[PDB]
Amino acid sequence: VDADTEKRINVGKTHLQTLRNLETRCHDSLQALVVIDAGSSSTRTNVFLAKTRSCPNKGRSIDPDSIQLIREGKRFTGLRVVLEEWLDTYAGKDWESRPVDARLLFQYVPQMHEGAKKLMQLLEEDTVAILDSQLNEEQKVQVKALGIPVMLCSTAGVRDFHEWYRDALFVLLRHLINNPSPAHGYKFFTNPFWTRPITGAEEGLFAFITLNHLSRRLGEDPARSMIDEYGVKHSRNDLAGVVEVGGASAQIVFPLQEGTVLPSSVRAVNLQRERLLPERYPSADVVSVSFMQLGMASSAGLFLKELCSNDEFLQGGICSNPCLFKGFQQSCSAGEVEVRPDGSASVNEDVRKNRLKPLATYCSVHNPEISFKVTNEMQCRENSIDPTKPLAERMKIENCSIIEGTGNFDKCVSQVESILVAPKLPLPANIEAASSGFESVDQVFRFASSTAPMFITGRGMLASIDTLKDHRLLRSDFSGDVEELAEAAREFCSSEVIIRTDGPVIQLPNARGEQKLNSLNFDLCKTMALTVSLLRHMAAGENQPSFIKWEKSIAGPDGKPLADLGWQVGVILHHVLFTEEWGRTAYEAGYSHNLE
Amino acid sequence: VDADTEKRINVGKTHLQTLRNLETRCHDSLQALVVIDAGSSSTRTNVFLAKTRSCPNKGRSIDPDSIQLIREGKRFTGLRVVLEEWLDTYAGKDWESRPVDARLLFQYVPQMHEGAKKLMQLLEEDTVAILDSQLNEEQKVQVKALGIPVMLCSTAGVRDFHEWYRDALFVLLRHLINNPSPAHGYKFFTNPFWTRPITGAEEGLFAFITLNHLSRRLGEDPARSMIDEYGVKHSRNDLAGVVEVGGASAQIVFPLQEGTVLPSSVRAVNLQRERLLPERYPSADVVSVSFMQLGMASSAGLFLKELCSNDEFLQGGICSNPCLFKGFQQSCSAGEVEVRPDGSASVNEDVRKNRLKPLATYCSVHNPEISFKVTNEMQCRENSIDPTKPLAERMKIENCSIIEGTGNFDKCVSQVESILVAPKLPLPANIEAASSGFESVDQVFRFASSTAPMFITGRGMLASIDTLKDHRLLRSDFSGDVEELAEAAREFCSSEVIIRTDGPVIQLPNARGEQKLNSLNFDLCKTMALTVSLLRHMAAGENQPSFIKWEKSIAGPDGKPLADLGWQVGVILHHVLFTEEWGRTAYEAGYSHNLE
Amino acid sequence: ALGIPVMLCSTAGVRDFHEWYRDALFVLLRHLINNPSPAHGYKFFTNPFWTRPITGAEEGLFAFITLNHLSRRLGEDPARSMIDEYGVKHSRNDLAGVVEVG
Ligand SMILES: [Mg+2]
Ligand SMILES: [Mg+2]
Fold this sequence. Notes:
The structure is cut from a larger assembly and holds 3 copies of chain A.
Chain A: H1 2-22, E1 27-38, E2 43-55, E3 59-62, E4 68-72, H2 79-90, H3 109-134, H4 137-146, E5 148-154, H5 156-159, H6 165-177, E6 188-189, E7 196-197, H7 200-214, E8 225-227, E9 233-235, E10 241-245, E11 249-255, E12 269-270, E13 285-292, H8 296-307, E14 314-315, E15 317-321, E16 329-331, E17 337-339, E18 345-347, H9 357-362, H10 368-371, H11 374-381, H12 391-395, E19 400-405, H13 409-421, H14 431-435, H15 441-447, E20 454-457, H16 459-470, H17 482-493, E21 496-500, E22 503-507, E23 514-516, H18 524-539, E24 548-550, H19 567-576, H20 579-589
Parallel strand pairs in A: 1-5, 5-6, 5-7, 10-20, 15-19, 20-24
Antiparallel strand pairs in A: 1-2, 2-3, 2-4, 8-9, 10-11, 11-13, 12-13, 14-15, 16-19, 17-18, 21-22, 22-23
Bound molecules: magnesium ion (2 copies).
PDB class: hydrolase
Keywords: hydrolase, Actin-like fold, NTPDase
Chains A, B, C: Nucleoside-triphosphatase 2
């Protein structure tokens, strides 16, 4: 009797203890976080999931290690196209070639709102579809109750935009995000801190935060850091640097090592001082520099313009391109290229699709940045763009009908060096890089350098190495050997274009094999030349990286990558890591700040 | 042309400025706050509305001046009845008269949860009905999105509850509040800081905060306070004290004035030090003391027991009650009284309805507070309750059949003084008052006193003054004059009970008029005697109040009262005023802390 | 008893100074300030936030703060500012700008 009732008493005592436990413990809940990448080629959503924890008398915070990308959405229109379309309608067609009174454009602010609305509705539909498809009903309840912070950040595409247009657009973009469709129940919200243009330096810093976070090099716990006898927290492992080559710009980011000698002209960033990371995180002094015109699309347009305006390459209407394969031929233009099933290359005539449009638009005498600044005019003229001429002739490669590939890798490297990496004057729209002390890529490793390991990122940068690895031209364990890379690329780039029944083919010189010719690999040799040039510049630095790695992705704890490389995770971390500020903005004010 | 387009430009510029304004300004939103009064006679909901404000980088807070009561709900069962019913079923009937092994009751914790559930569902239904009826659709959206903090606090009814029962009940009450019906969409939530028993001293302190808040005496802004040359914030007007007489206990609260001489045995509370008010509020040292058995219901039972066990009043089965009118007669019991249409008084026989049940239940040899403590046993025996006897004889007024009113006010005052205000031993269940240095009401003004103005509150306390004012026995501008009150009450209380066709009547001695005899005024003369006794004790103090006011309510800025007097507003303020803590618990953790 | 904070700031004279020289000099200047003569009893002290070169923009911003402070245009109290119905604090008087030619 007494033994059995003592157990019954213990069940009642347990029932109370289980409830005491519930009201004393921390409770975990799922939150969705949205990063809208307003890049040069497109505007795309990035839907993330994170675990939030609420503790009695401590508030709510995000576990930074729980941040995972659920999906990167569809590639919708870039903000540049939205604005230029608006100008076409309200300033009139060919505003690129005429003086425009910017003051008059203020009467068309509601119309800019209507144009922006169209894009915002597509992004909202895409975000909601991703959320509806990935979450279960219990997850949706949590995600819907917590609120969904939105961080729409613009990069190189509208970085060089003229007048007040872009900043007025941001005010409208935030208003649209703050008024989501009530039907879906997802409570999206933003503020001027989350949704804004980000500098190239910030863009680079955020990609550096992403890399070190995912690879477990960056952390604040005993596993990733150590506190010395003088109370200074050091990272347990070396923080790695990053080279990121996107569509319009390229970012070079590296932490500075102990006893680093910097000239007064070079401006390095302290992560804590510049409020990128909280005080509890290990300190670092980081060089972050971004170069406009160094992206895949923008350098392709600029390289063609410069190379085919050079008499060493332009003769009798034929521009001899050493960065293109033997047997490859295209119309002499910077228009978007399509490798057709018949082996022919079709150059798109649409001005909006021409890789020189952003540069030729910037380089105009009707842009106050050119008309008032000889400096900028001279940079434009140095790349064969006369800002005094209409848009059509600024984009035109004069007395040039056909571009023919010569497949000469060393000539390609030589030209990539003189045009892109080490030009006489800084490439246009680079006042930010110049202000931090760097006119060009060649100056980055001359003025500052580090033993910090380096990661090379970007779609083209990886395709360059992976292509050479696939044809067994490079070893699988390639660690950055310059001569090994140049020798491999010299062989691959001397390949002939053969037009076969199953479509065009890239034929390797010594029966080494072959691959299909397409719109993504036709000009890969320019990127290999960029890689070679970059590696030579890093190799010349006073301090060389401990190692160089090419990575598509970083594996998570379960062997599967939790998120992509890039600035997106970094921007999230930059806000969520400041616990108090995040609690106030994300939870205290929250989506309810928008209530009618 | 230029004048008209300049205006069109100004409309576009305005559109942007309006949006910049929205994303820079503070935004106001409506929140509902719920206070559940778990009192001695009942458990009732109190639904409040408040204006919250969210500012960029400042979080969210409540404007304390916006706190308004929307409705006080229905009187559902008190927590004492829930627990005693549970004991009746699981410890067996008449557990009040037998030894009970409390350890064995642990096996019935789920059953206590089921009993508590029944009451919680009624309170939730009542709260939701009030919210649905008072709010419009835009208000409901705000109220539903913000979350609804619930503060269920118990007072005198279960303050003296035996064993571990009450605290186990609170764990269950919180779990029930944290799991509301999902159907209504109102997100109710609590935690151990909001939902808990409150001491009599806290209860008094909260009623003091309510009074001074509503009357605009308490404040932190230049309108209600001033900062001196030494950085000390003083209230602009004197903070007033409060006497609150409820159903089971009476609270006496007053701030201490400059250079106040306190004996080491008297424990005064500092509002800031004891964390009742934040640092930004003016400081005050407050005497707060609560007396069990001084409430309307509890003193009525105790007074009858004591008076009718006295040979000066009990003779030949007739107890002569000087606190009852000439011609009034009732059965000799402390059972609930009903003045019937025929003029007869029906005494309820139900043990749960007897005004002595709480005291006779406390005063038991099977209660460890009596069996281990001679002190407590002696206090019980001093009020004619033998703790060794069964419940039925502890509640019984021995050799007494009929109570007859003598309408002798001075004899009534004399008895209220000896029984209630200045007893030989402290009235039972008063260890809290005794610990703060006060055994009885008479000791409060002897040991501590203040020039601070005083407010007299409670349903009966006000009816006492208002009755005498209505019959023109007291002037409309009555300011506390003892002799004026005693002279008025002596006249009113010498009234005869006449049984008329339209029902029973209270006939005033010198054709002064009349009023109906009912269940609420039959024993009002005891309360008038309590008032007289209290006023004499305050008048004897070293420092006397600047003024004494009887108030039913305090008028708001629009001439209409925003809330009632009592501890409810005070408990809200005690939590909402600590901005950071409130933001973390109410908004950061919020109702989402409960998400599955 | 309170200690004497020292703010040594350099302006246009060494703003255009080449190589690493100036920044190495600042590290030495701070060490010197942090080691005053014990004889006089005045406790001078600095840190890298107080003692450093200031940019032309900071120099201008600081002169703007000086002007508005002294002229009573800049303040957070009711005399120099007003909180609107939306909780935003505005300066009561227009903040003035500055042209400083050194
Ligand atoms: Mg990008
Ligand atoms: Mg009460």
